[PDB]
Design a binder for this molecule. Structure first.
Ligand SMILES: CC(C)CCC[C@@H](C)[C@H]1CC[C@H]2[C@@H]3CC=C4C[C@@H](OC(=O)CCC(=O)O)CC[C@]4(C)[C@H]3CC[C@]12C
Ligand SMILES: CC(C)CCC[C@@H](C)[C@H]1CC[C@H]2[C@@H]3CC=C4C[C@@H](OC(=O)CCC(=O)O)CC[C@]4(C)[C@H]3CC[C@]12C
Ligand SMILES: CC(C)CCC[C@@H](C)[C@H]1CC[C@H]2[C@@H]3CC=C4C[C@@H](OC(=O)CCC(=O)O)CC[C@]4(C)[C@H]3CC[C@]12C
Ligand SMILES: CC(C)CCC[C@@H](C)[C@H]1CC[C@H]2[C@@H]3CC=C4C[C@@H](OC(=O)CCC(=O)O)CC[C@]4(C)[C@H]3CC[C@]12C
Ligand SMILES: CC(C)CCC[C@@H](C)[C@H]1CC[C@H]2[C@@H]3CC=C4C[C@@H](OC(=O)CCC(=O)O)CC[C@]4(C)[C@H]3CC[C@]12C
Ligand SMILES: CC(C)CCC[C@@H](C)[C@H]1CC[C@H]2[C@@H]3CC=C4C[C@@H](OC(=O)CCC(=O)O)CC[C@]4(C)[C@H]3CC[C@]12C
Ligand SMILES: [K+]
Ligand SMILES: [K+]
Ligand SMILES: [K+]
Ligand SMILES: [K+]
Ligand SMILES: [K+]
Lengths: 242, 242
């Protein structure tokens, strides 16, 4: 019946989209990955030959460097670091810069996520609804000064999202030595709750302990962007959900 | 008015929860992080003293090791690797094992996420609704063989979630050299779309190219668990949402 027809039609489209994306990603990244692997292998071979590093100690050095990578940015388990980790956990971002090393800590993190995800989702939904109402009121007032259609609301939301993305990209590029495109990409990744972790803010020269204003601004920007995205999402998707 | 009262009451509870979580995480991880940092610093100092490694070349070695970490697991941009990356992107997991290195690739990934997230969400919601209806029908048939309350449905969903988590943990522990607790934690992280990236499957001895059955089973388990979690989320969260 329809329900099954729609359920099976969605699956086929999703599978086709996944296949197309995988094919494009392979065709675009195979040569680059091969070249990077060749260059890295040549460099490491040259370094090993020059320094006569033993093969057994190479694995130990790799493990030490990998384990000490988060520690090179300072102390990541202070009050600011713990707050950042909790914010990433509740928002399902998963940056991966710092992870618990204790089984009890892992269990506590799991319980924290379980007890916090629905509350954060409900709060974000309420904030998005309130922002949508405020935006509608502002648009009505502006039109009176100068009825509202959906398309106008959709365009206003898209423009607001683009402006927020541009502002965040400029702010993060002018305070962390990042390119405009790289900052925009990082902001988009952060606001979509994906969290690749390739670019992580508040990880340079101990900014988590010496720049409280920057941390506060980053938290405010993250919350504002999440609220903005939660309105565009529920005003284009929730209509077809139920 | 109530609306603002509820909106402001949610915020206070969320902030208190964040503060409590940050305090607990700090009090639980400060000493462990300090000990790990001290041990790593001592080990690296001893290694540098023994091998007489120059300071300038140490940064180059660290950069080479960091850039070559994904490549140590094989080829991550093949058909299987591209499919895995696309699956992680559309599901907003963000493992971070492989990331694009080209600006055009990053733009394509951003467009892919934008065009794929709503479709995946709608498909997951439909699958969860269908599974919920099937579970209700099965429960009614079982009760007839031996009306349904909401508490019974919640208990059945929780039991199904626990069973799926246990099965996935056992399967991933018996095929990737992992402990039961670590496998359970990794499965929980994967199913919540957090994606810390500390534990990533299909990254050992080139399993992405030599074990197609394992990759297919992992994909099926991920999809099933995502549907199961989405169903429970629909039961608990949507009733209080609208
Ligand atoms: C196993 C997992 C999925 C459990 C998830 C727990 C939720 C069912 C709880 C956790 C936080 C709760 C919320 C915390 C705070 C509030 C504000 C509260 O508002 C008021 O008390 C003032 C307004 C009014 O009088 O309704 C209404 C319930 C609500 C949304 C709660 C609804 C139920 C929530 C989402
Ligand atoms: C209404 C729209 C179009 C504009 C919104 C105003 C922005 C232009 C302002 C509002 C908040 C500002 C930010 C608030 C806090 C900071 C931290 C501040 O950092 C420091 O002062 C310490 C580090 C340093 O020395 O750079 C640098 C500027 C910045 C990013 C500000 C940049 C300019 C921002 C984004
Ligand atoms: C209704 C909305 C607008 C409430 C917004 C609340 C903010 C004003 C608060 C909430 C969380 C706070 C942050 C939580 C944690 C920290 C780390 C804290 O760092 C330390 O305590 C160590 C470094 C130092 O000694 O300054 C500095 C303040 C800061 C950035 C706080 C700044 C003020 C913030 C952003
Ligand atoms: C900028 C971003 C937010 C754009 C998001 C795009 C969505 C508005 C699109 C993308 C995929 C679309 C879905 C793709 C497939 C289908 C199945 C389709 O079902 C059928 O064609 C059979 C049943 C029927 O006849 O209705 C109904 C619409 C729907 C849910 C579409 C609804 C609109 C969706 C969610
Ligand atoms: C109804 C519930 C209670 C049980 C569901 C059945 C499971 C016990 C089965 C169903 C799918 C099975 C998996 C399907 C595929 C594989 C890949 C398979 O890998 C290989 O054959 C190649 C690698 C190797 O040589 O180990 C190892 C077993 C495993 C994980 C299977 C383990 C047992 C599973 C989870
Ligand atoms: C309605 C539902 C049940 C549909 C389920 C579809 C699956 C049966 C398909 C969809 C995606 C497929 C996978 C997509 C990609 C790959 C990588 C592919 O690897 C290669 O082509 C290189 C290695 C080799 O030569 O085997 C092996 C098959 C596999 C695991 C496929 C196995 C079969 C899968 C899981
Ligand atoms: K992530
Ligand atoms: K990550
Ligand atoms: K990582
Ligand atoms: K997510
Ligand atoms: K994520």
């Amino acid at each position: 019946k329809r329900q099954n027809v729609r359920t099976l039609s969605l699956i086929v489209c999703t599978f086709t989209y996944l296949l197309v994306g995988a094919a494009v990603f392979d065709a675009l990244e195979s040569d680059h990955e091969m070249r990077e692997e060749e260059k890295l292998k040549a460099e490491e071979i040259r370094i090993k030959g020059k320094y006569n590093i033993s093969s057994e100690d190479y694995r130990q050095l790799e493990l030490v460097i990998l384990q000490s990578e988060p520690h090179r940015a300072g102390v990541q388990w202070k009050f600011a670091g713990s707050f950042y980790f909790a914010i990433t956990v509740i928002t399902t971002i998963g940056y991966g810069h710092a992870a618990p090393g204790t089984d009890a800590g892992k269990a506590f993190c799991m319980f924290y996520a379980v007890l916090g995800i629905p509350l954060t989702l409900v709060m974000f939904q309420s904030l998005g609804e309130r922002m949508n109402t405020f935006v509608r009121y502002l648009l009505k007032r502006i039109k009176k000064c100068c009825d509202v259609s959906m398309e106008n609301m959709v365009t206003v939301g898209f423009f607001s999202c683009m402006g927020t993305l541009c502002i965040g990209a400029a702010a993060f590029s002018q305070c962390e030595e990042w390119s405009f495109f790289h900052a925009y990409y990082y902001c988009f990744i952060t606001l979509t709750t994906i969290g690749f972790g390739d670019y992580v803010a508040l990880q340079t020269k101990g900014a988590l302990q010496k720049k409280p204003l920057y941390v506060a601004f980053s938290f405010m920007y993250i919350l504002v962007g999440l609220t903005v995205i939660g309105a565009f999402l529920n005003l284009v998707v929730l209509r077809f959900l139920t």
